[PDB]
Amino acid sequence: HKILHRLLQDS
Amino acid sequence: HKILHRLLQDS
Amino acid sequence: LSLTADQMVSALLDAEPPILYSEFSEASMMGLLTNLADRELVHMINWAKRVPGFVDLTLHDQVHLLECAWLEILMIGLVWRSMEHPGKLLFAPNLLLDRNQGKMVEGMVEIFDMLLATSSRFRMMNLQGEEFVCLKSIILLNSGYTFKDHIHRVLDKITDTLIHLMAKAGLTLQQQHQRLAQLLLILSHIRHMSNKGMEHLYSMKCKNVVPLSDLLLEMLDAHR
Amino acid sequence: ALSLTADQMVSALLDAEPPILYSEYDPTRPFSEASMMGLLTNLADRELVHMINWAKRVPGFVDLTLHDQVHLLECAWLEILMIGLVWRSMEHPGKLLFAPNLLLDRNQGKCVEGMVEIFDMLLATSSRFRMMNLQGEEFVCLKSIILLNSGVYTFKDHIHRVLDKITDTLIHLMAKAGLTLQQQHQRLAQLLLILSHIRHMSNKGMEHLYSMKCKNVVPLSDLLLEMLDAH
Ligand SMILES: C[C@]12CC[C@@H]3c4ccc(O)cc4CC[C@H]3[C@@H]1CC[C@@H]2O
Ligand SMILES: C[C@]12CC[C@@H]3c4ccc(O)cc4CC[C@H]3[C@@H]1CC[C@@H]2O
Ligand SMILES: [Cl-]
What we know:
The complex is a heterotetramer, with 2 copies of chain A, 1 copy of chain C and 1 copy of chain D.
Chain A: H1 3-7
Chain C: H1 5-15, H2 26-48, H3 59-82, E1 88-92, E2 95-98, H4 109-125, H5 129-142, H6 149-168, H7 173-205, H8 214-222
Antiparallel strand pairs in C: 1-2
Helix pairs in contact in C: 1-6, 2-3, 3-4, 3-5, 3-7, 4-7, 5-6, 6-7
Chain D: H1 6-15, H2 33-55, H3 66-89, E1 95-99, E2 102-105, H4 106-109, H5 116-131, H6 136-149, H7 157-176, H8 181-214, H9 222-229
Antiparallel strand pairs in D: 1-2
Helix pairs in contact in D: 1-7, 2-3, 3-5, 3-6, 3-8, 5-8, 6-7, 7-8
One estradiol (EST) is lined by residues 33-34, 36-37, 40, 74-75, 77-78, 91, 111, 197, 200-201 of chain C.
Protein name (chains A, B): Nuclear receptor coactivator 2
Subcellular location (chains A, B): Nucleus
Organism (chains A, B): Homo sapiens (Human)
């Protein structure tokens, strides 16, 4: 999945 | 003139 | 301007263009659609002259607004015509197209989806004809920050007329403001579809397979 | 959530604002098409990272599925950068303040093929905000509307209620600025009509960036590459 999908998950 | 330009007047 | 909200509505209702008829391959369908679009542009030019305020603009500004808005206006018209036909676009009464015929042309089915999505949205909101003609006038006057106090004051008037309509339909103040926002947010999606449509239409001309008429070529040169 | 007052809604949005970032602009040398496109996209890329955090703080956004979050950001990201830019350029007549150390007039925009048109549109939107005297509270509402609205009719009722709440919040701000009831709906319409012009600029800016990429003018980050692709 997309780079963004992952980035959206960190804090 | 642009075509449009004259359709706009046209009596 | 001087007229009442209701006189504003009768004027727009009466200036409405008629619905036109049509007469597949990627060529035969682009033929039909651009033929229809061409014949409708002629009526739109006369409709625009009946949008109150518009005939007091220089012939330069009139040219410009029409060039900016023409596909947006065709699109909202089409969406409106298609409201009571879920899943279909009523380009003409004898040209009712489902989503899958959209696949008949490369690049199209995504524009088709955006149009069905909009139609559905109107259906949902249960958009009235009176609201429709206001939205359509707003598109004309608004879509050409491109190059006018007078224009912005006609725009206020149409906002007033819209609110007026919602007030008469018995909506609370809060609901009026919320419905007004909803309707105007849809115009930015219509602007978006028009942008996409201008590209696709351009990429058809360039291939030079379908033949576009002169009025139609001029519009598509104005977007450079 | 759906139960915030207008006052708390404004408070959250102001709270969530991203920082103004600096560019790596090097004033030792004149601009070229590549170096200027380089500065702008390096800036956009870093801004996008803060945008992702800001979005997660917009009421109702983190309630969406990850896929819908991705979709909304993919639809809205350039609109959001653009209105951010127009906001900070407001008290800078005829100039675009991309960063506090990157203040550009339209003549400098000339050094990138096809940039100056988009410059001209950005400058016109900025003047328009200045003439309306757009307030900060109104600006952060608009920016939230863009995020929630721009991808919504493109694949929902949840999003529509939050959008309605921002509308109420907008009306509330105007009411307490003392605008009459007519002025409230007129101003609400004017602000939202500008969003249509911001969508248009976004569409123009996206094609321009695509062409810069197709011509190998600058290297694009992987995030920026994937944003472009979504389009
Ligand atoms: C311009 C296109 C052909 C003409 C189409 C049309 C044709 C007639 C009409 O009444 C409305 C529309 C809107 C969508 C338009 C299409 C979008 C892409 C296609 O190129
Ligand atoms: C996307 C472009 C580069 C990045 C630009 C940018 C870069 C950073 C920023 O904060 C805002 C903007 C808005 C305009 C954008 C430009 C419009 C066309 C150009 O390709
Ligand atoms: Cl940084």
